[PDB]
């Protein structure tokens, strides 16, 4: 089950009523406007999270109460939301640098982390673009292809040091091999250098 949000200067009240009916929550109330475009479809947790994020920005907060009830109370520029799945790396490993990113961004941008290991981004398209660039880059970097290269003569831990000292490479003392990891270009290079020290 997936939800969408496309609002453009929609009266805050109307937004809250719309979201409550979608979520099967009673809403008790507050003034303002709201704009937001969902770049990806959101599940119910993410939709509800968006709702909280837009309310927080306008200066409001939610109080969940008896029997599925939510009381609203006082607390490039396009406002967008996006959910970025992360495939190779734990999402909280990105947290410190995503926080750094937002301290340059300015206000009204929010990164949310899901225990299913996806990050949700709410804010200005430019800020969201930057945050996506970084998530994806770190994600892709954690999925480098690995390759074992056996050594006939040299000691694996020496070659591990010597090249790790002047630069990933790891030794296997048991089988006396080196495990190099990177892209076709960088492994080609390392394969050759290792071969010459044999």
């Amino acid at each position, epitope marked *: 089950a997936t939800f969408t949000a496309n609002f453009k200067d929609t009266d805050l009240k109307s937004f809250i009523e719309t979201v409550g009916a979608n979520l099967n929550k009673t809403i008790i109330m507050v003034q303002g406007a709201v704009s937001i475009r969902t770049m990806t479809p959101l599940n119910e*947790r*993410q939709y*509800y*999270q968006l709702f*909280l994020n837009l309310l*927080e920005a306008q200066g409001y*907060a*939610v109080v*969940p109460m008896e029997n599925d009830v939510l009381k609203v109370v006082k*607390s490039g520029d396009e406002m967008v939301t996006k959910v970025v799945p992360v495939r190779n790396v734990s999402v*909280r490993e990105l*947290a*410190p*640098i995503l*926080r*750094q990113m937002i301290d340059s961004a300015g206000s009204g941008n*929010v*990164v*949310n*982390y*899901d*225990p299913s290991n996806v990050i*949700m981004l709410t804010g200005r398209a430019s800020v969201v673009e930057r945050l996506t660039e970084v998530i994806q880059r770190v994600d892709h970097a954690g999925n480098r292809t690995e390759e074992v290269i056996p050594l006939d003569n040299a000691s694996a831990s020496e070659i591990a040091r010597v090249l790790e000292s002047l630069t990933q490479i790891v030794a296997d003392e048991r089988t006396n091999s080196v495990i190099v990891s990177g892209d076709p270009a960088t492994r080609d290079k390392m394969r050759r250098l290792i071969r010459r020290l044999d």
Partner: nanobody
Amino acid sequence: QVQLQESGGGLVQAGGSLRLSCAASGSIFSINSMDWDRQAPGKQRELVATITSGGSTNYADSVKGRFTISRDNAKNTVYLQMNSLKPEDTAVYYCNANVKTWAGMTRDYWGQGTQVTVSS
């Protein structure tokens, strides 16, 4: 909502110590972990230490044994006791609270930071 207010920064000599504090307020009940991280200009913000709501502590390799993270739930504050400070430690230290939201996701709130400077 959670608000964080750090303190304890200053200039110190190599081998000295400082004690950072951080007072949290707002939805304390939502806080499920609190950490210190640091940032020097031109470098990445990096995790230094963490104390969960269970009291479980976590420390970066560069600081383990020299820094201690600790808690005072009466005063709603966490502390970073920095001993044997090195020039490498020179950075703006931020206090961060990873809160649980009503939706079931998490969210970070953090303060303006406190500068620690270590001379030789």
